[PDB]
Amino acid sequence: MQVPHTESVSLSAGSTVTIKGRPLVCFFNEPHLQVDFHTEMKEDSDIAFHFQVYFGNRVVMNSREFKIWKEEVESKNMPFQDGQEFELSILVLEDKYQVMVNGQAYYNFNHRIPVSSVKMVQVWRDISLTKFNVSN
Amino acid sequence: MQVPHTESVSLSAGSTVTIKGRPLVCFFNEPHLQVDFHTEMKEDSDIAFHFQVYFGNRVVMNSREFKIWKEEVESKNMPFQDGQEFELSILVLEDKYQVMVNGQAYYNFNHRIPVSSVKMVQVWRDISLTKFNVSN
Numbered sequence: 001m002q003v004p005h006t007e008s009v010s011l012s013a014g015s016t017v018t019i020k021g022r023p024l025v026c027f028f029n030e031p032h033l034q035v036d037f038h039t040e041m042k043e044d045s046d047i048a049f050h051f052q053v054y055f056g057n058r059v060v061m062n063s064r065e066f067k068i069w070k071e072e073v074e075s076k077n078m079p080f081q082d083g084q085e086f087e088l089s090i091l092v093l094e095d096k097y098q099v100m101v102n103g104q105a106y107y108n109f110n111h112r113i114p115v116s117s118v119k120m121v122q123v124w125r126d127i128s129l130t131k132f133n134v135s136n
Numbered sequence: 137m138q139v140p141h142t143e144s145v146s147l148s149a150g151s152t153v154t155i156k157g158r159p160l161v162c163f164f165n166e167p168h169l170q171v172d173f174h175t176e177m178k179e180d181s182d183i184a185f186h187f188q189v190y191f192g193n194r195v196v197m198n199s200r201e202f203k204i205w206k207e208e209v210e211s212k213n214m215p216f217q218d219g220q221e222f223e224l225s226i227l228v229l230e231d232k233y234q235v236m237v238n239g240q241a242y243y244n245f246n247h248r249i250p251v252s253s254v255k256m257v258q259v260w261r262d263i264s265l266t267k268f269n270v271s272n
């Protein structure tokens with residue numbers, strides 16, 4: 001699957017975004033993973049949910065609203081395992097996005113932009129990708 | 137050309153490492169470029185020269201010695217142009233590495249590990265690559 005990966009989407013409460021991939025290099029060198037929920041197909045459009053994993057280090061979450069990054073949310077949760085394939089499940093809940101890694105929730109981000117405004121998802125940085133699916 | 141790109145090298149004063157590539161996404165989203173001069177072929181080996189461009193933002197340079205990152209050197213020079221192919225020339229001088237962008241030097245990093253200890257170069261993160269050459 002092509003990386004960067006860019007897809008049109010429609011999301012509502014009850015949607016799940018499933019992403020299966022593998023880091024391209026060892027964790028010691030801090031590969032990244034980035035998943036961005038965009039308001040338009042344009043790459044520089046606003047971002048309702050920015051999810052950036054610094055593998056082996058930390059996770060950063062934010063929104064970009066009218067071209068401006070807002071309040072950063074940090075996590076030190078690092079359930080990802082060096083060299084391993086991972087399954088990310090991003091659950092769209094009424095109040096927040098919830099990010100599961102291999103079936104358990106480790107990260108949460110309350111909605112700042114209504115989820116009905118999301119029109120595109122981009123998955124990119126230092127991973128190979130074998131699955132990207134938005135639930136029906 | 138495959139990215140991550142990993143090659144065995146031998147360097148001395150007078151060597152030039154030429155890298156031609158293009159960012160994979162727009163600068164507004166901060167793609168990165170990383171070039172690491174390693175002491176062994178192993179990916180987690182020590183790094184004589186770590187050169188990381190946060191496109192549209194800043195550049196970070198450092199060494200990793202006996203598995204420990206040392207003193208970070210920061211630059212705000214950003215000669216790279218959004219969406220454009222770039223030509224990086226890393227000159228190995230007696231005292232330092234000098235990084236040229238499109239034929240002019242913008243970054244410098246004094247040797248902390250002898251250059252004769254460098255055995256591998258890895259080029260990776262959010263670029264496509266069309267040329268990687270170590271001068272003869």
Ligand SMILES: OC[C@H]1O[C@@H](O[C@H]2[C@H](O)[C@@H](O)[C@H](O)O[C@@H]2CO)[C@H](O)[C@@H](O)[C@H]1O
Pocket residue numbers: 050052060061062069071072165166193
């Ligand atoms: O917040 C997401 C946003 O972060 C920007 O970088 C932050 C960095 O995470 C933080 O540690 C530092 O203090 O401020 C930086 C902003 O100047 C990234 O530039 C951007 O791409 C997003 O990842």
Ligand SMILES: OC[C@H]1O[C@@H](O[C@H]2[C@H](O)[C@@H](O)[C@H](O)O[C@@H]2CO)[C@H](O)[C@@H](O)[C@H]1O
Pocket residue numbers: 029030057186188196197198205207208
């Ligand atoms: O110095 C290169 C090294 O940087 C690490 O990240 C730094 C970051 O650049 C700096 O702004 C912050 O204050 O400290 C961080 C270290 O905790 C990266 O983790 C590493 O991969 C290299 O890029």
